[PDB]
Enzyme design. Structure first.
Site, short mmCIF file in Angstrom:
data_model
loop_
_atom_site.label_atom_id
_atom_site.label_comp_id
_atom_site.label_asym_id
_atom_site.label_seq_id
_atom_site.Cartn_x
_atom_site.Cartn_y
_atom_site.Cartn_z
N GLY A 171 0.80 -1.21 0.00
CA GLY A 171 0.00 0.00 0.00
C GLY A 171 0.84 1.26 0.00
O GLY A 171 2.07 1.19 0.08
N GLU B 263 17.11 -11.79 19.78
CA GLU B 263 17.37 -11.95 21.23
C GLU B 263 16.39 -11.07 22.04
O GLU B 263 15.84 -11.53 23.04
CB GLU B 263 18.83 -11.62 21.60
CG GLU B 263 19.79 -12.80 21.61
CD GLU B 263 20.93 -12.73 20.60
OE1 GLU B 263 21.85 -11.89 20.79
OE2 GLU B 263 20.93 -13.54 19.65
#
Ligand code: GTP
Ligand code: GTP
Ligand code: LOC
Ligand code: LOC
Ligand code: GDP
Ligand code: GDP
Ligand code: MG
Ligand code: MG
Lengths: 432, 432, 4, 132, 433, 432
Positions: free
Chosen positions: A10, A246
């Site tokens: 978009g 992480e």
């Protein structure tokens, strides 16, 4: 080699995409033609026998205007023609149009190009999907795409950069509908998602960058910096640098609870008196100042279930640890009884770079705080209220039903949102 | 019982292991190229235990370097003694373990396991008589924790008659804010109980506290923590490496240190506690050296030895000293604090002396204790585990890899049983 | 916590 | 009372004798095994080998179970990724067809109304016709 | 020939063996290559080859190669044939079960094969002299396996032991009390006479007499060596007392199980203890009853004597010895058992006590070794028995033995036999009939 | 959604349509021959929407001119920019419709309908992507009202997926042609309710009142009335013809403006009000321009906005003006007049700004409102209809064409239902 594919859907998707890729090019010294003078950048850019660096990205829109600008722009030649896909007519702010009507006509083509980018990967990490919640394409096409990427790529990681609607920055009346519809559909297919409240960006652009009437370029250049901070860990090999995956493990304790709050500092205007400098304690304090958030909500009256810090530039461990302390004594940063405190810190060598013709000031050190807070459920609540106002009278519903949708699909989406709100409630209560 | 094959797994495993090799090579008089340059022939008499004799004057470590991440291999090879290791012995993967035990133990780990076992086979078959194995790894991450324990059980199948000795680093929230660490450690402990013969419990909580409280280092680094570990690893291996009182291997140690099979977790300790740059004057006598090594502040495991009782104790002294003065100081401690040494194991505290002192230090003493107080370390991990597990927090990352809640409840149960066992012998009295 |  | 030298033997590099200082205080009487055999010793050793190798065999039995567990977890992970795809495929096909059918019906209904209007207009023209 | 075969098992056995064979070579004028300069009696311990080479009638065994490799490369390398120095690859790791069952089974037939080879070279094999520690896995486990087998292959031939008794101050490992009791039980019926050597006793003498505050194994072994040559002087030379191995059982052992004589030696003088006057008989005789000179730490004053031998070496005359017995008899207790006569079996060997030139022991014109059977020796078993009970009550370390194929029942049986031995030492001391 | 097909039907339809083309051609820099002569390229960017590109430098309107009378179409052809239209696109009859809806819908009209549809087909097939259709007609006459609605339903059959937008002029006795006008308008309204997506209600009552009361023109003419209509048509079409708020087409407008299908009738409005050619021009400020948004006097439909409530509002500002000043003035109106904007449609008033001002006017603002007040217009027609119908007055003109009284009663019923519907949402409350 741990590659990542960016998908821009978009107008908002495409436009933010343009800001992001311009900024990445700058940070890695890649020219608008794909050339670089004389590594980890290979995760986002592929190479040819010509020494050309081509972004591992696909730009999609059901309408041609926005991408045509890219095809004619400064960064034409940077992207291959095949990776910039367009349709003839847009979804006209209708989720149903982007998802079923118009969407069905372009999906196989988009997937075919994603498959082509995926064959060039010896260890694809996953996808980064950029879209608005409001647009017909941003909502329905993205939902359709996520459902299909789940089939083609199974469990393969999918992260979102979603634009949260705001009245003061060009919304449309039906945007609350599309927001809830897309949220429900994408919820189980998305592994992690960073919301960007357009009001929050608008407010920073005014209260910090001193722009009374901020343009999309102003808004996107600011979003770009925050996106760059999140992706820096993937695009650079740093010693004290902690990888975004992480933080992700710390950020998402339950599959549905995957919406981290993002905070950035320092946001200084290019025109103001530069001489002042910046300290690690100053930015860490600004990391807890609500005026610097990407989503308008209140963490101060809410509970944390992760709190991460992403530093870039000239940052030393001695400074950071002193900054993580002192601030938790003064401020009230309540964590859930099943989560430890302690902030997950990542420091990248590469300082924060700025676009030369931009309104952002160059800084020695910058920080991005990604935190998992119950306070994010307030943004869902605001959207849900607007949906309830209109849905009670079944206003605009006929546009969706006319495209093949059912009224039952509206209630199911809203039921899932209520469950999400209750899920964020339950997650904050203490154990026995 | 002559040759030992060393294995280093994960970030921590390879980091700590690299330093051990730097330290021992220096003491054995081996330069970073692999050639001998030392003075006394006593450095060569037992070189075969850790080093292979290559074509000419080249001594190559019998070490196998393992990781699912390339990062660590690159740093170790560039590191001080990077050119000493056998290039074929570097068994490294591309996609990491994401600090997830399940990925290391079942997913990614199980795909690299056989490649490692092929290198262990090659090294094992070039031994006149294989003494056993030594693994360096952390229990907090994913490769060291998961793949390390997977390596242990797979080695155990092939070499049941060989001794399995590990240097296992225990996680702490004081040093590492990776939330899942208590899950990884609990799943690892279960494995170590079943499959190792001896485990040196290197606690990061204790290491942090020594650096912070004793060494007065405000912001301790991994290097500061690893300096304490290398000292301990040099000290614990002295008897295997030098002719300082012969005919003692890995099995003789296990037989005399472990009275019960499951209770094979040692509380290490070193004296004097040193800093990498602290220029210390030529002093220290045996009465103060003995006094230090029996104090809580000198323990590499965050347990108060005064909270439990010693099953067995091994003490190794280095440098030019009086052996007479050593034994007199040893029983002085025993007789003064008798309530901390089990009455039902006569002469449970054994001492060894070696003329060769470490680098810089003119005299030092390493302590190896089998104390019931080690249950404090296991209880700490157990409490951290339950807090999370009670609310099924971060479980999806594990179930996503094919694991079940049954496996978690079982790991917790074995951890609790181990605690009961320690308490059982802490209360045991030889009155009847 | 920032160890290094 | 005295010392008695009983005397024993003599040789080139030695001499031996007995010295009886005090006589013994007492003079009297107190001042199935079927061992050893190579069969008994080997039966003891063979029974000891049997015990040792059984323990080793049972230790391998537990490890064989561990090896097969790791097999079922890798299989769970694959069966679950395969089902996730299977469900996601059919839920999408179901939605896509359900949306096709609906839209098809809505556009048919609105065309049916327009057709009814066309029928009425042909009826209007005939209604105008009255030849007289 | 009244020939004797010496068997050295484990580190201690091998190391003491090295000290003994060094001392024997010196006493008979044999060089480290096996060459002599030229009373015939040495042939009982050394055989001859076509080259005039004198080869010890001994076999060195260890389940590990280190200790024997030192012999194979040492000063005495051209003395032993390669075939008589046997080694394995991995040791018994202080585990009796490993030396007896696991590792032991793999080398036993080979050891026996070499003993059979030494035995074929014998025209009148007297028996065996087994050297080992109580503590070591090989010393305890392999020795017991060996004794059981030697009884089968050599029926009724005499077997004497030189056993090293564990001491905390002289190395020792936590499981040594277990191995000591296990070996004692197994060997008990296969041994005719056994001389215990308390490592603490040797250590003490090395501290106060030889003035070595930290004694090495070489110091300890050189002292043990002198006491062993005293015991074997009668076999190796044309002596008159203890001339055969059966004579040891006759002069000391009254009941099969009561086979542990206490050994005492004098004079133990340091080489660097200035150059003082030589103290003759009656002075060395009085030191034979001084507990500080014993090989096993116990109290014969508490105990009862049931045999007493006096082995005088060097320049000793019968006139002096009888006067020395006359002086020691008066005022001193030395209580004998009712059935046994009160007195001594005396022996003088005209050969002087020789010393290793690079050693810490002073050369003397006359020495004495007392071999006495006392009830006091049961005190050494009692100390060992207590340490075993402490650990066994909690079944500590037991798994290492069970893991090797041994049974928990074997532990109780061994301890039951030790209790019986303690009670047997009690019963002998009480009134006869 | 690019190309729009325009259709002009009847006297009013062709008159109003001719002026729209005159005005827009002038705004796009097109002369009466069809050639471009404008300054800025922004005139050409969205030219394809209303204009076809002919062989050479020519631009031909995508317009179809329809009538059952030859008169008007001849006058248009001779008039200004009459030569610009495609000659083949002039579909005319000779009989006329005699201001009778039945003649246009059933008799005369049904005989010419297919000829028109053939021209619509030709134009539709020469479109890259057909946006939709726009019809200009009156509801008072016979051709525009009858044939116009017949064209709508016939187009609806062929192009159901295309947007149908109309500029519909409502009759008034103040400015009239025939007594039957309330019949024609009632029969037309019924059709528009069912078949259009959007309808701009151009009321002749409001047009007469502006010219008479405000413009002070004693005897207003159709030229005076049409000058107001062309201003409104120029303004309402701005975002389709020029870039800025772009990615906005006919469907996006309908989706955001129409909450309920039947309620698609807009109340147009313009500021400042001007007399044809007769404007001396004075500077109209932004706060003044916004003040004429609630102004009943500025409405193109004779309804008082304060008598109803706004469902949705679209405001377009044209000329050089501060955008900042615009939004703040728009917000002031909404906060001060909150009781006139439905609470159940959050952010229902949208604003667009275009730098290009209309002809003569330096600054202007057009207003598009979906207000429940439009029921005043329908009630007015309904009252006029019943007055006549109650006495079956002029009915033989309709029954003579084959119509029945049943059709009239039905048209009236739908008209009354539409009124009920507007009232239904006027009274609808959010339940705060
Ligand atoms: N921050 C930012 N927001 C944007 C941008 N473009 C559009 N938006 C926002 O996204 C929503 C508009 O959705 P769009 O992305 O323009 O619509 P679309 O996804 O292209 O789909 P269509 O309805 O078919 O046009 C509104 O909330 C806008 O404020 C942009 O470039 N930057
Ligand atoms: N007097 C003396 N004692 C020794 C000597 N070597 C070992 N010992 C003692 O014997 C015990 C050690 O047993 P070792 O003989 O060394 O062990 P091993 O028989 O070789 O059997 P393994 O367990 O397989 O090594 C301890 O009590 C030591 O003090 C020695 O040379 N002289
Ligand atoms: C192509 O022409 C137009 C198209 C639209 C709008 C509009 O008025 C500003 C137009 O000008 C007439 C529009 C209208 C009303 C809305 O609701 C109030 C809306 O949310 C949203 C809009 C439009 N969106 C915006 C951000 O203005 C889309 C459709
Ligand atoms: C190979 O290295 C070693 C091996 C052992 C020991 C030891 O500590 C002194 C070592 O150094 C770590 C050892 C340890 C502890 C004992 O008691 C708990 C023991 O009885 C006995 C020992 C050892 N024996 C001696 C005489 O120290 C055997 C094994
Ligand atoms: N003492 C020490 N601990 C470390 C080091 N590196 C990581 N750790 C610890 O090890 C755990 C993380 O395990 P790690 O080895 O980094 O992950 P892996 O590579 O997946 O096995 C955490 O508890 C860290 O605090 C190091 O160099 N020294
Ligand atoms: N505003 C305006 N209204 C008109 C114009 N011409 C006719 N009308 C109105 O349109 C209605 C008559 O419809 P008309 O177009 O003239 O008849 P048709 O040709 O049969 O469709 C009446 O209400 C007239 O007031 C014009 O040029 N402008
Ligand atoms: Mg769009
Ligand atoms: Mg040994």
């Amino acid at each position: 080699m741990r590659e990542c594919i960016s998908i821009h859907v978009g107008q908002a998707g495409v436009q933010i995409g343009n800001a992001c890729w311009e900024l990445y090019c700058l940070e890695h010294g890649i020219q608008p033609d794909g050339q670089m003078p004389s590594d980890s950048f290979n995760t986002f850019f592929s190479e040819t026998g010509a020494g050309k660096h081509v972004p591992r990205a696909v730009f999609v829109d059901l309408e041609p205007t926005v991408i045509d600008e890219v095809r004619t722009g400064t960064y034409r030649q940077l992207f291959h023609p095949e990776q910039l896909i367009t349709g003839k007519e847009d979804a006209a702010n209708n989720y149903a149009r982007g998802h079923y009507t118009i969407g069905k006509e372009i999906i196989d083509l988009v997937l075919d190009r994603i498959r082509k980018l995926a064959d060039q990967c010896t260890g694809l990490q996953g996808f980064l999907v950029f879209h608005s919640f409001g647009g017909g394409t941003g909502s329905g096409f993205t939902s359709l795409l996520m459902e299909r990427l789940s089939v083609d790529y199974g469990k393969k990681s999918k992260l979102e950069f979603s634009i949260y609607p705001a009245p003061q920055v060009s919304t449309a009346v039906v945007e609350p509908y599309n927001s809830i519809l897309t949220t429900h559909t994408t919820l189980e297919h998305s592994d992690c998602a960073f919301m960007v409240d357009n009001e929050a960006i608008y407010d920073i652009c005014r209260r910090n960058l001193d722009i009374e009437r901020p343009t999309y370029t102003n808004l996107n250049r600011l979003i770009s910096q925050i996106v760059s901070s999140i992706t820096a860990s993937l695009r650079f090999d740093g010693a004290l640098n902690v990888d975004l995956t992480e933080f992700q493990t710390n950020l998402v304790p339950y599959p549905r609870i995957h919406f981290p709050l993002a905070t950035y500092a320092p946001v200084i205007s290019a025109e103001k008196a530069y001489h002042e400098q910046l300290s690690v304690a100053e930015i860490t304090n600004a990391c807890f100042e609500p005026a610097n958030q990407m989503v308008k909500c209140d963490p101060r009256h809410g509970k944390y279930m992760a709190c991460c810090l992403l530093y870039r530039g000239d940052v030393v461990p001695k400074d950071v640890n002193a900054a993580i302390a002192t601030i938790k004594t003064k401020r009230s940063i309540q964590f859930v009884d099943w989560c430890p405190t302690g902030f997950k810190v990542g420091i990248n060598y590469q300082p924060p770079t700025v676009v030369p013709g931009g309104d952002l000031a160059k800084v020695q050190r910058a920080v991005c705080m990604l935190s998992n807070t119950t306070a994010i459920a307030e943004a869902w609540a605001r959207l849900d209220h607007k949906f309830d106002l209109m849905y009670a009278k079944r206003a605009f519903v006929h546009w969706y039903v006319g495209e093949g949708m059912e009224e039952g699909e509206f209630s199911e989406a809203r039921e899932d949102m209520a469950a999400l709100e209750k899920d964020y409630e339950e997650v904050g209560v203490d154990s026995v | 019982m002559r040759e030992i094959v060393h294995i280093q797994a994960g970030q921590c495993g390879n980091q700590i292991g690299a330093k051990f090799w730097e330290v021992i090579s220096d003491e054995h008089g081996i330069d970073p190229t692999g050639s001998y340059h030392g003075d006394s022939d006593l450095q060569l008499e037992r070189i075969n235990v850790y080093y292979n004799e290559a074509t000419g004057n080249k001594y190559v470590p019998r070490a196998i370097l393992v990781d699912l991440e390339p990062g660590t291999m690159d740093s170790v090879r560039s590191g001080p003694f990077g050119q000493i290791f056998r290039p074929d012995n570097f068994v490294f993967g591309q996609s990491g373990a994401g600090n997830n035990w399940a990925k290391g133990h079942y997913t990614e780990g199980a795909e690299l396991v056989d490649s490692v076992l092929d290198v262990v086979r090659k090294e094992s078959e070039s031994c006149d008589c294989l003494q056993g194995f030594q693994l360096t790894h952390s229990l907090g991450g994913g490769t060291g924790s998961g793949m390390g324990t997977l390596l242990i059980s797979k080695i155990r199948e092939e070499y049941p008659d060989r001794i399995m000795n590990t240097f296992s680093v225990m996680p702490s929230p004081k040093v590492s804010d990776t939330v899942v660490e208590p899950y990884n450690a609990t799943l690892s402990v279960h494995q170590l109980v079943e499959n190792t013969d001896e485990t040196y419990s290197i606690d990061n909580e204790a290491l942090y506290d020594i650096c912070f409280r004793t060494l007065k280092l405000t912001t301790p680094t991994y290097g500061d923590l690893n300096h304490l570990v290398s000292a301990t690893m040099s000290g614990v291996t002295t008897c295997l490496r030098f002719p300082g009182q012969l005919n003692a291997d890995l099995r003789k140690l296990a037989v005399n240190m472990v009275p019960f099979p499951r209770l094979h977790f040692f509380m290490p300790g070193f004296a004097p506690l040193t800093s990498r740059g602290s220029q210390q004057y030529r002093a220290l006598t045996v009465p103060e050296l003995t006094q230090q090594m029996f104090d809580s502040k000198n323990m590499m495991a965050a347990c108060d030895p005064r909270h439990g009782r010693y099953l067995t104790v091994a003490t190794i002294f280095r440098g030019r000293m009086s052996m007479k003065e050593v034994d007199e100081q040893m029983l002085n401690i025993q007789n003064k604090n008798s309530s901390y040494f089990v009455e039902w194991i006569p002469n449970n505290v054994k001492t060894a002396v070696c003329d060769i002192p470490p680098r810089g230090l003119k005299m030092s003493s390493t302590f190896i204790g089998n104390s019931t107080a080690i249950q404090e370390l296991f209880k700490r991990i157990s409490e951290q585990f339950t807090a999370m597990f009670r609310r099924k927090a971060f479980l999806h990352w594990y179930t996503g890899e094919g694991m079940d809640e049954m496996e978690f409840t079982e790991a917790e149960s074995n951890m609790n049983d181990l605690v009961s066992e320690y308490q059982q012998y802490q209360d045991a009295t030889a009155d009847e | 916590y920032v160890t290094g | 009372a005295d010392m008695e030298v009983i005397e024993l033997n003599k040789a080139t590099s030695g001499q031996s004798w007995e010295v009886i200082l005090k006589p013994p205080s007492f003079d009297g009487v107190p001042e199935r095994r079927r061992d050893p055999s190579l069969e008994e010793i080997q039966k003891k050793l063979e029974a000891a080998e049997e015990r040792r190798k059984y323990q080793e065999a049972e230790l391998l039995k537990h490890l064989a179970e561990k090896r097969e567990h790791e097999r079922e977890v890798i299989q769970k992970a694959i069966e679950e990724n395969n089902n996730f795809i299977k469900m996601a495929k059919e839920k999408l096909a179901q939605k896509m067809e359900s949306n096709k059918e609906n839209r098809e019906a809505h556009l048919a209904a609105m065309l049916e109304r327009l057709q009814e209007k066309d029928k009425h207009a042909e009826e209007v023209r005939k209604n105008k016709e009255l030849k007289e």
